[PDB]
Design an enzyme around this catalytic site. Structure first.
Site, PDB file in Angstrom:
ATOM      1  N   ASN A   1     -30.934 -23.803  18.706  1.00 17.01           N
ATOM      2  CA  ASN A   1     -31.415 -24.922  19.503  1.00 17.01           C
ATOM      3  C   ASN A   1     -32.162 -25.845  18.557  1.00 17.01           C
ATOM      4  OD1 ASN A   1     -32.906 -26.628  21.268  1.00 17.01           O
ATOM      5  ND2 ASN A   1     -32.580 -25.103  22.894  1.00 17.01           N
TER       6      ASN A   1
ATOM      7  N   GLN B   1     -35.970 -26.380  19.846  1.00 14.45           N
ATOM      8  CA  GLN B   1     -36.851 -25.273  20.261  1.00 14.45           C
ATOM      9  C   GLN B   1     -36.852 -24.263  19.107  1.00 14.45           C
ATOM     10  OE1 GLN B   1     -36.160 -23.623  24.240  1.00 14.45           O
ATOM     11  NE2 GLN B   1     -35.652 -25.632  25.156  1.00 14.45           N
TER      12      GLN B   1
ATOM     13  N   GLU C   1     -29.987 -21.232  13.147  1.00 10.44           N
ATOM     14  CA  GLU C   1     -30.333 -22.296  14.073  1.00 10.44           C
ATOM     15  C   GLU C   1     -29.417 -22.178  15.305  1.00 10.44           C
ATOM     16  OE1 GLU C   1     -32.492 -24.140  15.215  1.00 10.44           O
ATOM     17  OE2 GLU C   1     -32.599 -25.904  13.966  1.00 10.44           O
TER      18      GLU C   1
ATOM     19  N   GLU D   1     -34.579 -18.798  12.691  1.00 12.35           N
ATOM     20  CA  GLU D   1     -34.236 -19.786  11.675  1.00 12.35           C
ATOM     21  C   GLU D   1     -34.783 -19.399  10.306  1.00 12.35           C
ATOM     22  OE1 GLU D   1     -35.978 -20.269  14.579  1.00 12.35           O
ATOM     23  OE2 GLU D   1     -35.483 -22.220  15.478  1.00 12.35           O
TER      24      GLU D   1
ATOM     25  N   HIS E   1     -18.948 -36.907   3.100  1.00 12.82           N
ATOM     26  CA  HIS E   1     -19.539 -38.090   3.703  1.00 12.82           C
ATOM     27  C   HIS E   1     -20.915 -37.806   4.286  1.00 12.82           C
ATOM     28  CE1 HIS E   1     -17.542 -36.815   7.627  1.00 12.82           C
ATOM     29  NE2 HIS E   1     -18.704 -37.240   8.072  1.00 12.82           N
TER      30      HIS E   1
ATOM     31  N   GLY F   1     -18.821 -31.940   8.809  1.00  8.87           N
ATOM     32  CA  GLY F   1     -19.238 -30.994   7.817  1.00  8.87           C
ATOM     33  C   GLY F   1     -19.228 -29.560   8.281  1.00  8.87           C
TER      34      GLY F   1
HETATM   35  C1  LIG Z   1     -19.623 -36.687  11.743  1.00 13.44           C
HETATM   36  O1  LIG Z   1     -20.200 -35.830  12.561  1.00 13.44           O
HETATM   37  C2  LIG Z   1     -18.476 -37.519  12.370  1.00 13.44           C
HETATM   38  N1  LIG Z   1     -17.630 -38.173  11.411  1.00 13.44           N
HETATM   39  C3  LIG Z   1     -17.564 -39.484  11.317  1.00 13.44           C
HETATM   40  O2  LIG Z   1     -18.246 -40.241  12.017  1.00 13.44           O
HETATM   41  C4  LIG Z   1     -16.676 -40.032  10.210  1.00 13.44           C
HETATM   42  C5  LIG Z   1     -17.474 -40.407   8.954  1.00 13.44           C
HETATM   43  C6  LIG Z   1     -17.011 -41.822   8.583  1.00 13.44           C
HETATM   44  C7  LIG Z   1     -16.718 -42.475   9.951  1.00 13.44           C
HETATM   45  N2  LIG Z   1     -16.107 -41.338  10.679  1.00 13.44           N
HETATM   46  C8  LIG Z   1     -15.277 -41.358  11.709  1.00 13.44           C
HETATM   47  O3  LIG Z   1     -14.899 -40.306  12.251  1.00 13.44           O
HETATM   48  C9  LIG Z   1     -14.744 -42.700  12.220  1.00 13.44           C
HETATM   49  N3  LIG Z   1     -13.356 -42.839  11.803  1.00 13.44           N
HETATM   50  C10 LIG Z   1     -12.992 -43.545  10.748  1.00 13.44           C
HETATM   51  O4  LIG Z   1     -13.827 -44.029   9.976  1.00 13.44           O
HETATM   52  C11 LIG Z   1     -11.542 -43.739  10.493  1.00 13.44           C
HETATM   53  C12 LIG Z   1     -10.562 -43.625  11.456  1.00 13.44           C
HETATM   54  C13 LIG Z   1      -9.241 -43.856  11.177  1.00 13.44           C
HETATM   55  C14 LIG Z   1      -8.855 -44.161   9.851  1.00 13.44           C
HETATM   56  C15 LIG Z   1      -7.432 -44.328   9.491  1.00 13.44           C
HETATM   57  O5  LIG Z   1      -7.095 -44.670   8.330  1.00 13.44           O
HETATM   58  O6  LIG Z   1      -6.580 -44.023  10.411  1.00 13.44           O
HETATM   59  C16 LIG Z   1      -9.809 -44.280   8.880  1.00 13.44           C
HETATM   60  C17 LIG Z   1     -11.159 -44.085   9.178  1.00 13.44           C
HETATM   61  C18 LIG Z   1     -14.910 -42.836  13.741  1.00 13.44           C
HETATM   62  C19 LIG Z   1     -14.510 -44.253  14.142  1.00 13.44           C
HETATM   63  C20 LIG Z   1     -16.363 -42.573  14.154  1.00 13.44           C
HETATM   64  C21 LIG Z   1     -17.664 -36.734  13.439  1.00 13.44           C
HETATM   65  C22 LIG Z   1     -16.927 -37.728  14.331  1.00 13.44           C
HETATM   66  C23 LIG Z   1     -16.724 -35.705  12.862  1.00 13.44           C
HETATM   67  C24 LIG Z   1     -20.704 -37.644  11.176  1.00 13.44           C
HETATM   68  F1  LIG Z   1     -20.243 -38.510  10.252  1.00 13.44           F
HETATM   69  F2  LIG Z   1     -21.701 -36.982  10.596  1.00 13.44           F
HETATM   70  F3  LIG Z   1     -21.243 -38.382  12.148  1.00 13.44           F
HETATM   71 CA   LIG Z   2     -34.303 -23.850  16.694  1.00  8.95          CA
END
Ligand SMILES: *[C@](=O)([C]([N]C(=O)[C]1[C][C][C]N1C(=O)[C]([N]C(=O)C1=[C][C]=C(C([O])=O)[C]=[C]1)[C]([C])[C])[C]([C])[C])C(F)(F)F
Ligand SMILES: [Ca+2]
Length: 240
Positions: free
Chosen positions: A61, A64, A59, A69, A45, A189
């Site tokens: 900070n 900064q 990496e 890096e 995603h 990720g």
């Molecule tokens: C990550 O850093 C980030 N991951 C997320 O934000 C992911 C990516 C898609 C949206 N998401 C979520 O964590 C969201 N949850 C859902 O979309 C979700 C919850 C429950 C269900 C289910 O079936 O029970 C399905 C989908 C929440 C609401 C933000 C972090 C949080 C790991 C990044 F995407 F990069 F931001």
């Molecule tokens: Ca840095």
């Protein structure tokens, strides 16, 4: 990371920052794990998006000059073929990035140790999430790399109705859910590092959190289970 502490700069040398171009600048969007000198493992995603990416290894900070890096382009992106856009609960939330150069290794830049195929952690196993993600729900990214201790929640407990129910699959790892500590946006990720037989290995790729917030009791952070994808990873690397 909600409820994090600042990581020492040489604790988690496989952590990378995945950044996108923003005008004149670059912005952190996700974590990743360096798995070869020219390959990064991240969440699908993070990269199934209309953005131009770079990876930063060494990496610490985001705001900064660390003096450690290496900045490198993303040359090829291979998303798992079963990933469905914007659908974290369906699983397969994993992608590999071939870097435009091979980075040099040092105490800040090392390959992540991956578990053997099929390995499953006992409930309550010791793990740390790391990343620069939000430090509070609806907050801001960390400047310095954060870590938080998130013990695993096994599949039986995690897929029970008091936890995530049918949302969680056996190709995922659950960790945390204490209401205090969790991943949050921008940790996606990155690695979940778990200590087994004296060695940390990267058992998870951070994927998602609750619709109620990042740090929610009995809604552990959910990760793609790396050990379910070893053959996939190896096939991608060998074919590219
Ligand atoms: C990550 O850093 C980030 N991951 C997320 O934000 C992911 C990516 C898609 C949206 N998401 C979520 O964590 C969201 N949850 C859902 O979309 C979700 C919850 C429950 C269900 C289910 O079936 O029970 C399905 C989908 C929440 C609401 C933000 C972090 C949080 C790991 C990044 F995407 F990069 F931001
Ligand atoms: Ca840095």
């Amino acid at each position: 990371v909600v409820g994090g502490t600042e990581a020492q700069r040489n604790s988690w040398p496989s952590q990378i920052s995945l950044q996108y171009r923003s005008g004149s600048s670059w912005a952190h969007t996700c974590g990743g794990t360096l798995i070869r000198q020219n390959w990064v493992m991240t969440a699908a995603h993070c990269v199934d998006r209309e953005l131009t990416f770079r990876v930063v290894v060494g990496e610490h900070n985001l705001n900064q000059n660390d003096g450690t890096e290496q900045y490198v382009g993303v040359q090829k992106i291979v998303v798992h073929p079963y990933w469905n856009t914007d659908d974290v609960a369906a699983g397969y939330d994993i992608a590999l990035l071939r870097l435009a150069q091979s980075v040099t290794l040092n105490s800040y830049v090392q390959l992540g140790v991956l578990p053997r195929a099929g390995t499953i952690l006992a409930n309550n196993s010791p793990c740390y999430i790391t990343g620069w993600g939000l430090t509070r729900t609806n907050g801001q990214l960390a400047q310095t790399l954060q870590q938080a201790y998130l013990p695993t929640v096994d599949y039986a407990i995690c897929s029970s109705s008091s936890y995530w129910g049918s949302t969680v699959k056996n190709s995922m790892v659950c960790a945390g859910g204490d209401g205090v500590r969790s991943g949050c946006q921008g940790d996606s990720g990155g690695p979940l590092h778990c200590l087994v037989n004296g060695q940390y290995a990267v058992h998870g790729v951070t994927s998602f959190v609750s619709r109620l917030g990042c740090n929610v009791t009995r809604k552990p952070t959910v990760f793609t289970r790396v050990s379910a994808y070893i053959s996939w990873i190896n096939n991608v690397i060998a074919s590219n």
